[PDB]
Every structure is written in structure tokens, then in C-alpha cells.
Amino acid sequence: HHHHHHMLKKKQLTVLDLHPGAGKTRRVLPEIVREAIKTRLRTVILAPTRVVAAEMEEALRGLPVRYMTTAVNVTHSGTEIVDLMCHATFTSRLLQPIRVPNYNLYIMDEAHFTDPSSIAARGYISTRVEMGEAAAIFMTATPPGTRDAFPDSNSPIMDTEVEVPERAWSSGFDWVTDYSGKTVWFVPSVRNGNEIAACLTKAGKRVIQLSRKTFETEFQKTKHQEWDFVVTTDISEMGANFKADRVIDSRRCLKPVILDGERVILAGPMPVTHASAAQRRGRIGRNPNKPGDEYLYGGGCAETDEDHAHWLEARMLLDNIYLQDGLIASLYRPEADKVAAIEGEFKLRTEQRKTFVELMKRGDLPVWLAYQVASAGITYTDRRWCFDGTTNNTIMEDSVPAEVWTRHGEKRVLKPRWMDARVCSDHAALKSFKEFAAGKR
Ligand SMILES: Nc1ncnc2c1ncn2[C@@H]1O[C@H](COP(=O)(O)OP(=O)(O)O)[C@@H](O)[C@H]1O
Numbered sequence: 001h002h003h004h005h006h007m008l009k010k011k012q013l014t015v016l017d018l019h020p021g022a023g024k025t026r027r028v029l030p031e032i033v034r035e036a037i038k039t040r041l042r043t044v045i046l047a048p049t050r051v052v053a054a055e056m057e058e059a060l061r062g063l064p065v066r067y068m069t070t071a072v073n074v075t076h077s078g079t080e081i082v083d084l085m086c087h088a089t090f091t092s093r094l095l096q097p098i099r100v101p102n103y104n105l106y107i108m109d110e111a112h113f114t115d116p117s118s119i120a121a122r123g124y125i126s127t128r129v130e131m132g133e134a135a136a137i138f139m140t141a142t143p144p145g146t147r148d149a150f151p152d153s154n155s156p157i158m159d160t161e162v163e164v165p166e167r168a169w170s171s172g173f174d175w176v177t178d179y180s181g182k183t184v185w186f187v188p189s190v191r192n193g194n195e196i197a198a199c200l201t202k203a204g205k206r207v208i209q210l211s212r213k214t215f216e217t218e219f220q221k222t223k224h225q226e227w228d229f230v231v232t233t234d235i236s237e238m239g240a241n242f243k244a245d246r247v248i249d250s251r252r253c254l255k256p257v258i259l260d261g262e263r264v265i266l267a268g269p270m271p272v273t274h275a276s277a278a279q280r281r282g283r284i285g286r287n288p289n290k291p292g293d294e295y296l297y298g299g300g301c302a303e304t305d306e307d308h309a310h311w312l313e314a315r316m317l318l319d320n321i322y323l324q325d326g327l328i329a330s331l332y333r334p335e336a337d338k339v340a341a342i343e344g345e346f347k348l349r350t351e352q353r354k355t356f357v358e359l360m361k362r363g364d365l366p367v368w369l370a371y372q373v374a375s376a377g378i379t380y381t382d383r384r385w386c387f388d389g390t391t392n393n394t395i396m397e398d399s400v401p402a403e404v405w406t407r408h409g410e411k412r413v414l415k416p417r418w419m420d421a422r423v424c425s426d427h428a429a430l431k432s433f434k435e436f437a438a439g440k441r
């Protein structure tokens with residue numbers, strides 16, 4: 001009930017870069033949506049995750065918003081001119097035949113998200129603005145290329161550089177376990193998080209683990225049950241709210257890297273960006289009444305992340321989104337220097353584009369891998385490629401060849417024609433890929 005008037009300018013992109021916890025998501029977003037409604041601007045709100053989409057409903061209760069996500073179960077009047085969906089849904093719809101409205105205003109929250117669908121959505125939106133067809137607001141405390149890892153916070157934070165373990169320990173890290181508060185611990189990989197979580201559990205701690213595959217289900221447990229540690233990958237940088245007193249940050253993670261144009265490996269761990277570091281630290285210091293919060297960090301930051309597969313993968317997506325005849329959207333300008341590709345090199349014809357989309361949406365394949373399969377002319381249900389690669393593409397778990405009973409009634413060793421380490425980097429990813437290779441997804 002203290003609305004501040006925003007003069008929403010046509011043909012403009014604004015970056016709302018207030019510090020973490022300043023109220024972008026909970027205060028400024030509703031104000032903008034009210035102005036958009038008042039002035040009758042057809043508007044889309046882009047949430048990074050289903051978890052945040054649900055929370056945005058609380059902030060927007062009593063405003064006419066169409067929630068285009070099963071994460072919210074609200075009765076729609078059919079008259080709403082504001083739509084809410086996830087970054088990934090927005091990009092996926094753009095790749096499909098499905099008509100996406102030509103919105104007058106795009107509001108992307110947690111616009112730092114570097115998953116390929118988010119990077120692509122930013123390119124599309126910025127292109128629409130540059131063409132004079134729409135306005136946009138990108139909300140993030142950490143715009144592309146920030147070099148500040150220690151922004152302002154609602155309460156003071158105690159910043160300390162320490163040695164952070166990335167393996168189980170039996171001594172040398174008493175400060176981790178001799179602590180009666182609640183800790184969010186950012187780890188370099190799902191497997192390292194499993195090992196640390198087991199160590200913590202053996203030491204009597206209650207641990208919840210979060211990764212992209214599990215986030216949308218395990219995050220609820222952080223609200224609804226008692227815990228001592230959350231052990232999380234980078235997915236928790238995207239507007240994740242914890243009632244926590246301490247963050248432990250390894251400051252590095254495994255990175256997918258395309259090697260010689262022919263395979264994806266997981267390299268590193270390599271340092272995180274300043275943006276990632278500031279978002280990780282930004283999970284604490286958020287309560288103005290609580291002055292004790294600590295950030296313990298394990299090394300430096302770097303901006304040398306052009307080796308990351310996500311940039312090229314964003315181009316694969318954008319190349320397959322229609323704007324106008326002959327026009328391919330560039331990445332948003334601050335990100336466009338991250339990748340050297342020819343605009344349109346990854347454009348697919350209609351049937352192959354359909355396969356590319358289905359491999360990602362229903363197959364849950366990484367963008368790069370989905371592209372290799374689709375561009376080879378393979379149809380979605382034809383899994384022969386999972387078995388006919390070279391011998392060095394053999395997938396191992398527990399030091400033995402992963403084996404599958406195939407749709408054609410043979411026990412076969414998983415040996416994909418194209419190797420993307422993301423499909424076999426932890427037990428759960430591998431299980432899903434084995435199902436896929438069996439024709440049982
Ligand atoms: N359910 C809640 N009730 C009350 N305050 C909350 C709730 N969730 C978050 N907050 C607080 O609201 C403030 C603004 O949060 P938010 O808008 O999410 O920040 P930003 O998007 O700027 O990072 C912060 O102090 C945050 O901790």
C-alpha cells in the first residue's frame with residue numbers, strides 16, 4: 001500500500017540491480033505489475049524456477065495474473081493480461097509452433113540465471129526491445145560481468161576466507177561441525193555434495209541436498225522439515241530463500257566444456273564468477289534484525305567462463321526461434337562477447353527442430369546433445385545412437401560398463417555416438433539416461 005510510480009518507457013530495457021534482499025522480487029515486482037495492469041500493457045513475468053513462481057503468487061495475491069505453470073493452482077478469470085511462467089517454459093514455447101504473445105513488457109526476475117534457456121530468453125527479449133517492439137526489465141543484483149562479490153546486504157555479514165573441504169574428513173574442520181546454526185553449503189558437484197552430506201550425516205547432522213534434477217521437490221523440505229545443512233549446487237543462486245545463519249562456499253564448480261566440437265566433458269572444478277559468489281553470499285545477511293550471519297569462502301572468483309558450454313547452447317536455441325524473416329536474435333549485449341558463433345549456424349528445418357525440442361523437453365537431454373541427435377536426422381524414439389558409438393564413449397558406473405536391456409531385446413552396453421558427460425555425471429543422471437536408452441522414458 002505504498003506504491004511508487006514507475007514510468008514504464010516504450011522501447012527500453014532497464015536493469016534493476018538493487019543489492020540482494022533489497023526487495024526486487026517482493027516489493028518492486030508487484031509495483032511494476034500494478035503499473036502494467038493500470039496502463040493495460042500485455043506483460044509476461046519470467047521466474048527462474050517453479051519454486052519461485054509459487055512464491056511470486058504470494059507476492060501477487062489479488063492481482064489478475066495468469067499462472068502458466070502447474071506449480072500454482074489458481075482459478076483464472078480468462079481476463080488477465082499478465083502471464084507468469086518459468087524462463088525455460090518461455091524459451092521452449094518460442095521453439096514450438098504454439099503462439100507466444102507479442103508482449104509489450106517482459107519482466108525477467110533473477111536475470112543472472114546462466115542456464116541456456118535463460119541466456120536465450122534474454123537474447124530474444126533484448127532483440128525485441130532493440131527493434132523498438134517492446135520494453136523489458138531485467139531484475140538481478142548481479143548483472144552480466146559484475147566484478148563485485150561482496151555487495152550490500154540488509155544486515156552485516158562476516159566474510160572469512162577459509163579452506164573449505166571438498167571431500168569427507170575425519171579431522172581438521174571442527175568449525176564446520178562445532179556450529180549450532182543452519183548452514184547452506186555450495187559444493188562443486190552433485191557427487192562431491194553426496195560425499196560431504198554423508199560425512200555430515202555420520203557426524204549427526206540433518207542434511208538436505210539440492211541439485212537441478214531435485215530442486216523443485218527437495219527445496220520444499222527446507223521450508224517444511226528441520227535441517228542443519230543444505231548442501232547445494234549453483235541452482236540455489238536463483239532467488240532461493242533459506243532461513244540460514246551461515247554460508248559455506250567452495251567458490252568453484254565443475255563446468256561443461258565442448259572439446260573439439262565433438263564431446264562435452266565436465267572440467268575443473270574451476271572458479272565461480274563474481275556474480276555467482278555474490279549470489280551465494282547473498283543467501284544470508286537478509287534479515288535486518290539478525291546481525292550475526294557468516295560467509296566462509298574457499299578461494300577466488302574468475303570471469304574467464306567462455307569455455308562454458310551454456311553460451312554456445314544458448315545460440316543453438318536462439319537460432320531456432322523465429323522473430324521476423326532473416327532475423328536471428330543476438331544474445332543480450334553484455335553476454336554476446338562470451339561466444340564466437342555464426343548467427344544461424346544451428347538453425348534446423350521444421351521436422352528436425354521438432355525432434356530437437358522433444359529431446360530436450362521429454363528426453364531431458366542437454367541442449368548440445370539434443371542438437372547432435374536432431375541435426376543427424378534421427379527421430380525422437382530411435383535410440384540406436386545410444387549404443388553405436390566408439391569404444392571410448394562406453395559409459396561406466398562403479399567401474400563397470402553401464403548395460404541396458406534395449407527395446408529390441410538385447411542386453412547392450414551404453415556407448416553413445418555422442419558423449420555428453422552431463423548424462424552420466426551422477427547416479428540419478430545416469431539412471432535417467434539408461435531409461436532413455438531403453439526406450440522407457
Ligand atoms: N515470506 C517472507 N516474509 C517476510 N519477509 C520475507 C519473506 N521472504 C523473503 N523475505 C524478505 O523480504 C526481503 C526482500 O526479499 P526479496 O524481494 O526476495 O529480495 P531481492 O529479490 O531483492 O533479492 C528480504 O529481507 C527477504 O529476506
Ligand code: BEF
Nearest residue numbers: 019020021141239
Ligand atoms: F537479489 Be535477490 F537475492 F533476488
Ligand SMILES: [Mn+2]
Nearest residue numbers: 024025110239
Ligand atoms: Mn529476487
